[PDB]
Design an enzyme around this catalytic site. Structure first.
Site, PDB file in Angstrom:
ATOM      1  N   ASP A 188     -12.431  74.335  51.741  1.00 14.93           N
ATOM      2  CA  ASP A 188     -11.647  75.551  52.044  1.00 14.93           C
ATOM      3  C   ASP A 188     -12.396  76.861  51.849  1.00 14.93           C
ATOM      4  O   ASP A 188     -12.539  77.283  50.742  1.00 14.93           O
ATOM      5  CB  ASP A 188     -10.424  75.567  51.150  1.00 14.93           C
ATOM      6  CG  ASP A 188      -9.669  76.851  51.227  1.00 14.93           C
ATOM      7  OD1 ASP A 188      -9.597  77.391  52.340  1.00 14.93           O
ATOM      8  OD2 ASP A 188      -9.141  77.309  50.185  1.00 14.93           O
ATOM      9  N   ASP A 236     -11.657  80.910  57.886  1.00  8.49           N
ATOM     10  CA  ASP A 236     -11.054  80.047  56.897  1.00  8.49           C
ATOM     11  C   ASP A 236     -10.801  78.622  57.316  1.00  8.49           C
ATOM     12  O   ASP A 236      -9.731  78.314  57.851  1.00  8.49           O
ATOM     13  CB  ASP A 236      -9.718  80.619  56.457  1.00  8.49           C
ATOM     14  CG  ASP A 236      -9.198  79.924  55.264  1.00  8.49           C
ATOM     15  OD1 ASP A 236      -9.732  78.857  54.894  1.00  8.49           O
ATOM     16  OD2 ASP A 236      -8.299  80.472  54.648  1.00  8.49           O
TER      17      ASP A 236
END
EC number: 3.4.23.46
Length: 387
Positions: free
Chosen positions: A34, A230
């Protein structure tokens, strides 16, 4: 680097993960990759969605820090106990390091059932780490304790049709190249946009074209209140004004066909008989990013095959069904997995920049190909950053 190719399993709807090990003796875990957070964290207790977890008591080398920690994500949150331990990436360069680890005790909407990971690896910068910025994130630790250079790259490929979630765990969907670039995972030139500040991987978008027509907005709107890249977020997420304009524009391009408005809110599905998805009526989107040189940008172009994400049908048939993967945001622009899947993305931490290139793995349109193209001229790009 070849040992690192194909070291990621998963998909955009539930996250891409990498195998790692923690403690002596090594406990194997799947950990979600992440770039939108900075905390390395694992399940350390039993939980319905978890097949396994981290047993500190078994670690020969778990130290403890007697400190607590809470992280909230846009969706989901967890709470737990900071310690340290030895960590390896079996795919990842074979230097073992001591790293901060949060052992998760309580969690809400964070573990996903069937996703097959048990933890998360925040690859973003320290200023965002919980509980504060002196909790050195994994990658800072890896760079400081070894000779791994200070960058990594991500080729995410997802949703070969038709996907099975367990099967995705079975067959690969991407690569995280730790400490370099592997030139064989992209074609063309790498184009680089500056990392504007080192917290989230923050970039500046300076134009947006849809099927070649400029949305004609003040570019600050594009980055209100930040734009970031992201891997931990599924959709392309847009500020409330930008999003309204895209949707208006996309709906118009595809008006011949009939859709619920709740599809356009990303909740409902849509379906067509196998191989009849009318790809042509859906526009390409061009995000123009700030370049490395004065008055110079480049663009990345996104096909509908990335923003229409494939999902298994609720009344199960041989249909092709799709959730709409652009959603409203109020926390800035988020260039999520679905946008990243077209591309090889270099997180060049050492030179505070982010590189894009056409992926070796990309969705194929019979007549349209997504491309990373420059140079473009673009005046007053600094204006575009929000303050």
């Amino acid at each position: 680097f070849v040992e690192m190719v194909d070291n990621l399993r998963g998909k955009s709807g539930q996250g891409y993960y990498v195998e790692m090990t923690v403690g002596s003796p090594p406990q194997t875990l799947n950990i979600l990759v992440d770039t939108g957070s900075s905390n390395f964290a694992v399940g350390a207790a039993p939980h319905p969605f978890l097949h396994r977890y981290y047993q500190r008591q078994l670690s020969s080398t778990y130290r403890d820090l007697r400190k607590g920690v809470y992280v909230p994500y846009t969706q989901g949150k967890w709470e737990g106990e900071l310690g340290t331990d030895l960590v390896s990436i079996p795919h990842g360069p074979n230097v073992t390091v001591r790293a901060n680890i949060a052992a998760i005790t309580e969690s809400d909407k964070f573990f996903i059932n069937g996703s097959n990971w048990e933890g998360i690896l925040g690859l973003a910068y320290a200023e965002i780490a919980r509980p504060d910025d002196s909790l050195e994130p994994f990658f800072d630790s890896l760079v400081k304790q070894t000779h791994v250079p200070n960058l990594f790259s991500l080729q995410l490929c997802g949703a070969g049709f038709p996907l099975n979630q367990s099967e995705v765990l079975a067959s690969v969907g991407g690569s995280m190249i730790i400490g370099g670039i592997d030139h064989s995972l992209y074609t063309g030139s790498l184009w680089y946009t500056p990392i504007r500040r080192e917290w989230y991987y923050e970039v500046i978008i300076v134009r947006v074209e849809i099927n070649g027509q400029d949305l004609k907005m003040d570019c600050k709107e594009y980055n209100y209140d930040k734009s970031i890249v992201d891997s931990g977020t599924t959709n392309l997420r847009l500020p409330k004004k930008v999003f309204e304009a895209a949707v208006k524009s996309i709906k118009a391009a595809s008006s011949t066909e009939k859709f619920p408005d709740g599809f356009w809110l990303g909740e409902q599905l849509v379906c067509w008989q196998a191989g009849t998805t009318p790809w042509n009526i859906f526009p390409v989107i061009s995000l123009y990013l700030m370049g490395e040189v004065t008055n110079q940008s480049f663009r990345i172009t996104i096909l509908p095959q990335q923003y229409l994400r494939p999902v298994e049908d609720v009344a199960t048939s041989q249909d092709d069904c799709y959730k709409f993967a652009i959603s409203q945001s109020s926390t800035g622009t988020v260039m999520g997995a679905v946008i990243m899947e077209g591309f090889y993305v270099v997180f060049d931490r050492a030179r505070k920049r982010i590189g894009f290139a056409v992926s070796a793995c990309h969705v194929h349109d019979e007549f349209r190909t997504a491309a990373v193209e420059g140079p473009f001229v673009t005046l007053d790009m600094e204006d575009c950053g929000y303050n």
